[PDB]
Design a protein around this ligand. Structure first.
Ligand SMILES: *[C@@H]1O[C@H](CO)[C@@H](O)[C@H](O)[C@H]1NC(C)=O
Ligand SMILES: Nc1ncnc2[nH]cnc12
Length: 251
């Protein structure tokens, strides 16, 4: 009994994409906020109501249903046709609890960015945009077989992970995509450092006082790699849509 959200690439526009992201942001059901920024639930372990299904379909009707964790917006697995695939690191509760009545498989690689790079999918060389998304859905469906190609699944999920999860977390990434929607673009050093620092930013923001000062600054990068440090909430607030609930200092 999960919540579901749909997005079709057929006749898709930058507007249908943004409306989709905001529908997802709502269904993740964050609880409360920190400094005005929505704060994702700290705990939600029951697979029966701790995942949101994102139904992605392309112009040809091919469909891929992605399972996303409501506490982290983490993609743990997906279903295509009558089959389901899960990242090697997907917890047992989810593997057993999600996508029942499907032929289940556990991928031989994790869902983290470095695990995906092990399957040749690198953020720096993977195109993002509506066409890259149509192709990703197409590939996931084409690989709804026993002898699937892990490199195709990895690159396709890398596109999905950033266009859905990262964009849902960061308004900055959402707009990099929105204003490049009908084009193919690769994330730069700015987009990549944000993606990498979501946890640290989330912890420093939540634990800061009314003045918003971070106890420890967070290093980010400009498009060209030049580093800069975020030392206050307001310095990054306009770039974030959702905050992760982080307990201990992450690192
Ligand atoms: C980071 O900036 C360098 C130039 O300073 C550039 O060559 C590189 O492609 C950038 N990283 C990415 C993947 O955007
Ligand atoms: N599988 C995944 N889901 C969501 N965000 C991610 N960032 C890196 N890997 C991810």
């Amino acid at each position: 009994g999960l919540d579901t959200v749909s997005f079709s690439t057929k006749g898709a526009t930058y507007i249908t994409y943004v409306n989709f992201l905001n529908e997802l942001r709502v269904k993740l059901k964050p609880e409360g906020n920190s400094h005005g920024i929505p704060l994702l639930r700290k705990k939600c372990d029951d697979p029966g109501k701790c995942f949101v299904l994102v139904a992605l379909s392309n112009d040809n009707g091919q469909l891929a249903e992605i399972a996303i964790d409501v506490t982290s917006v983490y993609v743990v697995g997906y279903q295509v046709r009558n089959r389901s695939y899960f990242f090697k690191d997907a917890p047992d509760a989810a593997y057993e609890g999600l996508f029942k009545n499907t032929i289940k498989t556990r991928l031989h690689f994790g869902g983290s960015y470095p695990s995906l790079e092990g399957e040749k999918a690198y953020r720096e060389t993977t195109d993002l945009g509506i066409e890259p998304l149509r192709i990703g859905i197409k590939k996931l469906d084409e690989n709804a077989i026993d002898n699937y190609k892990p490199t195709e699944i990895a690159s396709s999920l890398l596109v999905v992970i950033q266009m859905v999860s990262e964009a849902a977390r960061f308004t900055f990434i959402e707009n990099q995509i929105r204003n490049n929607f009908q084009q193919r673009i690769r994330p730069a050093n700015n987009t990549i450092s944000l993606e990498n620092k979501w946890g640290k930013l989330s912890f420093q923001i939540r634990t800061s006082g009314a003045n918003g000062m971070f106890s420890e600054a967070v290093e980010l990068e400009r498009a060209n790699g030049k580093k800069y440090y975020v030392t206050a909430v307001d310095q990054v607030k306009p770039k974030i849509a959702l905050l992760k609930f982080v307990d201990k200092d992450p690192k």
